[PDB]
Design an enzyme around this catalytic site. Structure first.
Site, PDB file in Angstrom:
ATOM      1  N   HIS A  61       0.822  -1.203   0.000  1.00 25.32           N
ATOM      2  CA  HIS A  61       0.000   0.000   0.000  1.00 25.32           C
ATOM      3  C   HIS A  61       0.856   1.254   0.000  1.00 25.32           C
ATOM      4  CE1 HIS A  61      -3.168  -2.881   0.938  1.00 25.32           C
ATOM      5  NE2 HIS A  61      -2.509  -3.258   2.018  1.00 25.32           N
ATOM      6  N   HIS A  91       5.016   6.890   7.299  1.00 27.56           N
ATOM      7  CA  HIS A  91       4.777   6.543   5.904  1.00 27.56           C
ATOM      8  C   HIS A  91       4.193   7.774   5.214  1.00 27.56           C
ATOM      9  CE1 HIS A  91       0.936   5.984   7.955  1.00 27.56           C
ATOM     10  NE2 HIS A  91       0.426   6.457   6.827  1.00 27.56           N
ATOM     11  N   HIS A  93       1.522   9.215   1.735  1.00 27.19           N
ATOM     12  CA  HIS A  93       0.518   9.037   0.695  1.00 27.19           C
ATOM     13  C   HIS A  93       0.855  10.034  -0.411  1.00 27.19           C
ATOM     14  CE1 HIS A  93      -2.158   6.862   3.613  1.00 27.19           C
ATOM     15  NE2 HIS A  93      -1.496   7.617   4.465  1.00 27.19           N
ATOM     16  N   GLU A 103      -4.105  13.475   1.702  1.00 25.78           N
ATOM     17  CA  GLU A 103      -5.366  12.949   2.229  1.00 25.78           C
ATOM     18  C   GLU A 103      -6.192  14.097   2.814  1.00 25.78           C
ATOM     19  OE1 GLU A 103      -4.286   9.271   4.531  1.00 25.78           O
ATOM     20  OE2 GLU A 103      -5.103   8.450   2.658  1.00 25.78           O
ATOM     21  N   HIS A 116       2.744  10.910   7.386  1.00 27.47           N
ATOM     22  CA  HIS A 116       2.080  10.530   8.632  1.00 27.47           C
ATOM     23  C   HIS A 116       3.090   9.886   9.578  1.00 27.47           C
ATOM     24  CE1 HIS A 116      -2.054  10.286   6.469  1.00 27.47           C
ATOM     25  NE2 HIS A 116      -1.705  11.520   6.788  1.00 27.47           N
ATOM     26  N   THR A 195      -6.794   6.193   8.153  1.00 31.30           N
ATOM     27  CA  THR A 195      -7.257   6.480   6.797  1.00 31.30           C
ATOM     28  C   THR A 195      -7.188   5.273   5.867  1.00 31.30           C
ATOM     29  OG1 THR A 195      -5.151   7.210   5.907  1.00 31.30           O
ATOM     30  CG2 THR A 195      -6.507   8.903   7.028  1.00 31.30           C
TER      31      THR A 195
HETATM   32  N1  LIG Z   1      -2.787   6.477   7.353  1.00 33.42           N
HETATM   33  S1  LIG Z   1      -2.855   6.456   8.952  1.00 33.42           S
HETATM   34  O1  LIG Z   1      -1.750   7.233   9.483  1.00 33.42           O
HETATM   35  O2  LIG Z   1      -4.174   6.821   9.381  1.00 33.42           O
HETATM   36  C1  LIG Z   1      -2.577   4.792   9.508  1.00 33.42           C
HETATM   37  C2  LIG Z   1      -1.713   4.548  10.557  1.00 33.42           C
HETATM   38  C3  LIG Z   1      -1.519   3.241  10.993  1.00 33.42           C
HETATM   39  C4  LIG Z   1      -2.171   2.178  10.385  1.00 33.42           C
HETATM   40  C5  LIG Z   1      -1.908   0.754  10.831  1.00 33.42           C
HETATM   41  C6  LIG Z   1      -3.098   0.102  11.537  1.00 33.42           C
HETATM   42  C7  LIG Z   1      -2.863  -1.330  11.998  1.00 33.42           C
HETATM   43  C8  LIG Z   1      -4.108  -1.847  12.730  1.00 33.42           C
HETATM   44  O3  LIG Z   1      -3.855  -3.064  13.410  1.00 33.42           O
HETATM   45  C9  LIG Z   1      -3.043   2.447   9.344  1.00 33.42           C
HETATM   46  C10 LIG Z   1      -3.263   3.746   8.895  1.00 33.42           C
HETATM   47 ZN   LIG Z   2      -1.317   7.465   6.516  1.00 35.82          ZN
END
Ligand SMILES: NS(=O)(=O)c1ccc(CCCCO)cc1
Ligand SMILES: [Zn+2]
Ligand SMILES: NS(=O)(=O)c1ccc(CCCCO)cc1
Ligand SMILES: OC[C@H]1O[C@@H](O)[C@H](O)[C@@H](O)[C@@H]1O
Ligand SMILES: OC[C@H]1O[C@@H](O)[C@H](O)[C@@H](O)[C@@H]1O
Ligand SMILES: OC[C@H]1O[C@H](O)[C@H](O)[C@@H](O)[C@@H]1O
EC number: 4.2.1.1
Length: 257
Positions: A61, A91, A93, A103, A116, A195
Site C-alpha cells: 500500500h 509513511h 501518501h 489525504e 504521517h 485512513t
Molecule cells: N494512514 S494512517 O496514518 O491513518 C494509519 C496509521 C496506521 C495504520 C496501521 C493500523 C494497523 C491496525 O492493526 C493504518 C493507517
Molecule cells: Zn497514513
C-alpha cells in the site's frame, strides 16, 4: 483485499469495514476560516532526539519506516494530548501527478503528498490495545509540496530501489525523522480515524499548517514503487490516498491565533 484501484479502492472499503461510514472518519477538508483558535491547547512537544529507526518495508500500500518503540525514545506530547505517545512508524501518501496526493485538504486544496508520523498512547501498553481506545493514537500529518529538495528525505528516496515490490524490506538504521519537519509547529487538530482499513476511530490528528518542500525528482522516485509483489504484473504505487470524508459533529481547532 483492499487497495486503491477502481475495483478495491475507497468506494468499496465499507463492504468489509462498515466503520468506513462512521461518525469520525479521516481524512477531512480543513476549512481554515471555520477552524477556531483554542487557547486551552498546551505547547506541542516533538521529542525525537533519541529515535531508533530499524527497517523500511513495502507493504503493498505504501512504505513504512519502523522504529524501536520498546521504550520512550521518540515521543509526542502536549498540544491536545493527555500523556505520552510513542513513535512506531512513518509513511506517506502521494499522487500520480503533483496536483493530488494528500489525504487532508486545506480549503479544498490538494498537496502532492502527505507524511504521517504514527504514535500510540503509552498508558495502553502496546499498539494493539491502543487501537481499542478512543484516544489510543496520535498521527502527526505534514503536507509535501514540490519545489526545492528536502535534504532529510534523500536517504529515504535512495533506498526505494531496494524495496520496489510488496513484501520487500531493508535495514534502515540511524535515520533522524527530525529532518522531515518544517520550521513551524503551528497546527490544526481534530478527532478522527485511521485512513486505511481497518479505519478504526482511535486517532487524535495533528496536521501542521506549514508544508515541507520536496523536489520533483524526489517525488518521482516514490512513483516508481510497485503495489504488486515480485514476479507479478507491474502496478505503479501511485494515488494511495483516501479522499476527504464528512466532518459530521466535529470541530477543527487551531493552535495559532
Ligand atoms: N494512514 S494512517 O496514518 O491513518 C494509519 C496509521 C496506521 C495504520 C496501521 C493500523 C494497523 C491496525 O492493526 C493504518 C493507517
Ligand atoms: Zn497514513
Ligand atoms: N471491501 S474491500 O475494499 O476490502 C474489497 C474490495 C474488493 C474485493 C474483491 C477481491 C475484496 C475486498
Ligand atoms: O542517527 C539518527 C539519529 O539517531 C538518534 O538516536 C540520535 O540521538 C540522533 O542524534 C541521530 O541523528
Ligand atoms: O457554547 C460555546 C462553545 O461552543 C463550542 O462549540 C465551541 O467549541 C467553543 O469554543 C464555544 O465556547
Ligand atoms: O539512515 C538510513 C540509511 O541511510 C543510508 O541508506 C545509509 O547508507 C544507511 O546506512 C542508513 O541505514
Amino acid at each position: 483485499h483492499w487497495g486503491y484501484g477502481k475495483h478495491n479502492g475507497p468506494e468499496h472499503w465499507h463492504k468489509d469495514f462498515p466503520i468506513a461510514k462512521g461518525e469520525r472518519q479521516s481524512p477531512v477538508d480543513i476549512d481554515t476560516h471555520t477552524a477556531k483558535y483554542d487557547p486551552s491547547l498546551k505547547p506541542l512537544s516533538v521529542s525525537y532526539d533519541q529515535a531508533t529507526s530499524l527497517r523500511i518495508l513495502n507493504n503493498g500500500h505504501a512504505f513504512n519506516v519502523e522504529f524501536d518503540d520498546s521504550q520512550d525514545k521518540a515521543v509526542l506530547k502536549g498540544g491536545p494530548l493527555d500523556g505520552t505517545y510513542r513513535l512506531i512508524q512513518f509513511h506517506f501518501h502521494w499522487g500520480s501527478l503533483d496536483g493530488q496526493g494528500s489525504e487532508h485538504t486545506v480549503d479544498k486544496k490538494k498537496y502532492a503528498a502527505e507524511l504521517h508520523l504514527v504514535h500510540w498512547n503509552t498508558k495502553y501498553g502496546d499498539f494493539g490495545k491502543a487501537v481499542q481506545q478512543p484516544d489510543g493514537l496520535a498521527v502527526l500529518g505534514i503536507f509535501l509540496k514540490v519545489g526545492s529538495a528536502k535534504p532529510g528525505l534523500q536517504k529515504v528516496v535512495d533506498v526505494l530501489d531496494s524495496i520496489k515490490t510488496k513484501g520487500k524490506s531493508a535495514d534502515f538504521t540511524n535515520f533522524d525523522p527530525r529532518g522531515l519537519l518544517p520550521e513551524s509547529l503551528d497546527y490544526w487538530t481534530y478527532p478522527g480515524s485511521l485512513t486505511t482499513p481497518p479505519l478504526l476511530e482511535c486517532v487524535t490528528w495533528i496536521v501542521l499548517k506549514e508544508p515541507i518542500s520536496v523536489s520533483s525528482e524526489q517525488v518521482l522516485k516514490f512513483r516508481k514503487l510497485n503495489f504488486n509483489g515480485e514476479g507479478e504484473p507491474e502496478e505503479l504505487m501511485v494515488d494511495n490516498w483516501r479522499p476527504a470524508q464528512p466532518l459530521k459533529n466535529r470541530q477543527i481547532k487551531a493552535s495559532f491565533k
